[PDB]
Amino acid sequence: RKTNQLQYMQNVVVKTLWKHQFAWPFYQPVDAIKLNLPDYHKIIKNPMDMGTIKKRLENNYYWSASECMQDFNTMFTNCYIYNKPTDDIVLMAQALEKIFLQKVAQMPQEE
Ligand SMILES: Nc1ccc2n[nH]c(Br)c2c1
């Protein structure tokens, strides 16, 4: 069984974000070839995406919830590093990130 907090990351945070209309670009690792993203892996050192986060939760990978939160922070920040303020993907990430913050502020205590 996962920690209370990791269950919350899976059943509240990921479940909510996955269903959001803007989440789909984040469902799998950025494929820099398919997306024609020059030098993506030269500038983004630690790729992350919500499909990987969801798999890590399903597959019992994390030891504690802060590791999962760090993966979300990496995912969002990578989007901002690579893209300029007016890009649609930045607006999409910003909406998801606000929800992420609102939800992790309500993370439960372990008991
Ligand atoms: N980190 C990044 C940067 C640019 C992107 N375009 N589309 C997706 Br999904 C992206 C993710």
- Domain encompassing residue 104: 3-108
Q: What domain count does the chain have?
A: 1
* Chain centroid offset of residue 4 CA: 19
Q: Probe ligand 1: pick from 83, 86, 97, max atoms within 8 Å of CB? A: 83
By alpha-carbon position, which residue is closest to atom 11 of ligand 1?
79
Q: Ligand 1 centroid vs 4 CA: distance in angstroms?
A: 31
Pocket lined around ligand 1, Cβ cut-off 6 Å: 25-26, 30, 35, 37, 44, 78-79, 82-83, 89
CATH number at residue 92: 1.20.920.10
Helix extents (H) in the chain: 4-8, 15-19, 40-43, 50-58, 65-82, 88-104
Residues 6+ apart with CB under 8 A from 91: 22
Closest CA to 65 of 19, 20, 106, 17: 106
- Cα–Cα distance, 34 to 40 (Å, whole number): 12
Q: Ligand 1 centroid vs 41 CA: distance in angstroms?
A: 11
In angstroms, what is the resolution? 1.2
Distances (CA, A) of 66 to 18, 27, 69, 71: 19, 21, 5, 9
Q: Which residues of 19-45 are buried (b: 16+ CB within 10 A; e: fewer)?
A: eeebbebbeeebebeeeeeeebeeebe
